[PDB]
Structure 1
Amino acid sequence: MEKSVSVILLAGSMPKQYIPLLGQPIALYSFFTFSRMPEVKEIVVVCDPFFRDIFEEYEESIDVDLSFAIPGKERQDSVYSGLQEIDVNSELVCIHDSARPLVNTEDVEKVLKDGSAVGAAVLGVPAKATIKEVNSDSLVVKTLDRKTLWEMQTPQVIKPELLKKGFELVKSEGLEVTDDVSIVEYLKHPVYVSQGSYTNIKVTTPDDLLLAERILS
């Protein structure tokens, strides 16, 4: 389990993931969280060359190998680029959106374990809002059961062979990728939802930055 995990850290005015929270660019919070975990062998940072120095500065202080990959056009392209740089025998890849700086170590632990066990897992929390499918006539698609919808977060943790098979399938068949689990949806392999924390927010808007400071205290 030690040094078995490769992290792909998605990090591609300043883009939101480089703005500081308490003086430290957002992307560094999750970077340091992962670096400290004995399970994590390497972090492949997917970022524009311009920002490489933000991470390279801490290279000799961290207990992981630091690598880079070039971002792609869409998120899944950035995932793929990162994937080409991971260690040839990492048992798991841990993909994380750098705009989620508050991910707790204990939650990363949990999703790593679940991904190892199941093959694929993702941190999720129950959706608090009422959420429904709406059809092409703008009508609610009704359901009769208390139904339980979950909001996916990151990390998304997967055996690299499984992820590679997913990309192979989507490219070979020309399949649509429209949300953050579309690739694994095309496979028959199960995907576990590890229960996360509502504090694991994504910083998308400058109002988020204030919520993120509020949480850090």
Structure 2
Amino acid sequence: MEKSVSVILLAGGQGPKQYIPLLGQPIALYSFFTFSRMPEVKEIVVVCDPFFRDIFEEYEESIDVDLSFAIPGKERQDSVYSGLQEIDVNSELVCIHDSARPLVNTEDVEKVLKDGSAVGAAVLGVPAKATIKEVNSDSLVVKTLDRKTLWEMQTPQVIKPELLKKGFELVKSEGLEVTDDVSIVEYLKHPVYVSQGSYTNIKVTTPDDLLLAERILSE
């Protein structure tokens, strides 16, 4: 559905890597433009410090979405909630994206949007390549014989706004801890789909990442 999705673009982190260029363009703008071109996307709520607004506002008349801003909160989830208060009163779906993932492919965004529409909550993920284990408080491996297949979550995270709101309300009403980027939905009974993305959708955290990102962009 055209113009049914609101994007919350998380660009509130502080050194900032998401404004450093790749091929002359600030990292945040890559995903921003990917989303703007998609007919599905009605609006982009950028969550960023006022200082960086111009980075995005420069393109406002050139992009085929509405542009809005929200103020960052203290933790990532707070930034999500801030963006959430700015989305359209009738968008059917919210698409949360870390601006430090510039390389997300349109085709993968399309996938997670569809899955999110279908299921109600979906996140892009890839199978974890390393050997990963739970470790207990005595620093021992928690052993599994069964087939635990672990996936690394990326973004977008796509969710029906009502469902997200229900999660934030539960976490507030019960004072629940939020310890990774899917904790809010984990407290709900509603299913979360994992849409298979691409290993190229890396998050730029380190200086190493800047050249890797630039090197993928080479294509």
**TM-score, L = length of structure 2:** 0.98
Q: CA deviation at 1:121?
A: 0.1
Aligned length: 217
Alpha carbons of 1:13 and 1:27: their partners in 2 closer, same or farther (altered >3 Å)?
A: closer
Q: C-alpha separation between the residues in 2 aligned to 1:147 and 1:55?
A: 42
**Residue 80 of structure 1 corresponds to which residue in structure 2?**
81
Name which of structure 1's ranges 13-22 and 30-39 shifts more when overlaid on structure 2: 13-22
Q: CA deviation at 1:39?
A: 0.2
Q: C-alpha separation between the residues in 1 aligned to 2:13 and 2:104?
A: 25
**Residue 58 of structure 1 corresponds to which residue in structure 2?**
59
Alpha carbons of 1:13 and 1:149: their partners in 2 closer, same or farther (altered >3 Å)?
A: closer
Q: C-alpha separation between the residues in 1 aligned to 2:13 and 2:171?
A: 35
Q: C-alpha separation between the residues in 2 aligned to 1:64 and 1:17?
A: 21
Alpha carbons of 1:162 and 1:144: their partners in 2 closer, same or farther (altered >3 Å)?
A: same
Q: CA deviation at 1:93?
A: 0.1
- Give 3-state SS (helix, strand or coil) of 1:2's partner: coil
**Residue 10 of structure 2 corresponds to which residue in structure 1?**
10
Alpha carbons of 1:207 and 1:119: their partners in 2 closer, same or farther (altered >3 Å)?
A: same
**Residue 205 of structure 1 corresponds to which residue in structure 2?**
206
Q: CA deviation at 1:185?
A: 0.4
Deviations 1:161-212 (A, max 9, x none): 0000000000010000000000000000000000000000000001100000
Q: Which runs of 4+ in 1 moved over 3 A?
A: none
Q: C-alpha separation between the residues in 1 aligned to 2:211 and 2:176?
A: 39
Q: C-alpha separation between the residues in 1 aligned to 2:81 and 2:139?
A: 35
Q: C-alpha separation between the residues in 1 aligned to 2:147 and 2:200?
A: 25
**Residue 46 of structure 1 corresponds to which residue in structure 2?**
47
Q: CA deviation at 1:147?
A: 2.1
Which runs of structure 2 are paired with 1:18-167 in the superposition (5 Å)?
18-167=19-168
Q: C-alpha separation between the residues in 2 aligned to 1:186 and 1:145?
A: 24
Alpha carbons of 1:13 and 1:46: their partners in 2 closer, same or farther (altered >3 Å)?
A: closer
- Give 3-state SS (helix, strand or coil) of 2:108's partner: helix
Q: C-alpha separation between the residues in 2 aligned to 1:194 and 1:13?
A: 26
Alpha carbons of 1:35 and 1:13: their partners in 2 closer, same or farther (altered >3 Å)?
A: closer
Q: C-alpha separation between the residues in 2 aligned to 1:115 and 1:55?
A: 26
Deviations 1:138-166 (A, max 9, x none): 00000002320000000000000000000
Q: C-alpha separation between the residues in 1 aligned to 2:13 and 2:22?
A: 15
Alpha carbons of 1:52 and 1:127: their partners in 2 closer, same or farther (altered >3 Å)?
A: same
Q: C-alpha separation between the residues in 2 aligned to 1:35 and 1:63?
A: 6
Q: C-alpha separation between the residues in 1 aligned to 2:9 and 2:215?
A: 24
Deviations 1:107-134 (A, max 9, x none): 0000000000000000000000000000
- Give 3-state SS (helix, strand or coil) of 1:94's partner: strand
Q: C-alpha separation between the residues in 1 aligned to 2:184 and 2:58?
A: 34
Deviations 1:53-82 (A, max 9, x none): 000000000000000000000000000000
Q: C-alpha separation between the residues in 1 aligned to 2:98 and 2:109?
A: 13
Q: CA deviation at 1:13?
A: 13
Which runs of structure 2 are paired with 1:183-194 in the superposition (5 Å)?
183-194=184-195
Alpha carbons of 1:13 and 1:142: their partners in 2 closer, same or farther (altered >3 Å)?
A: closer
**TM-score, L = length of structure 1:** 0.99
Q: C-alpha separation between the residues in 2 aligned to 1:190 and 1:197?
A: 22
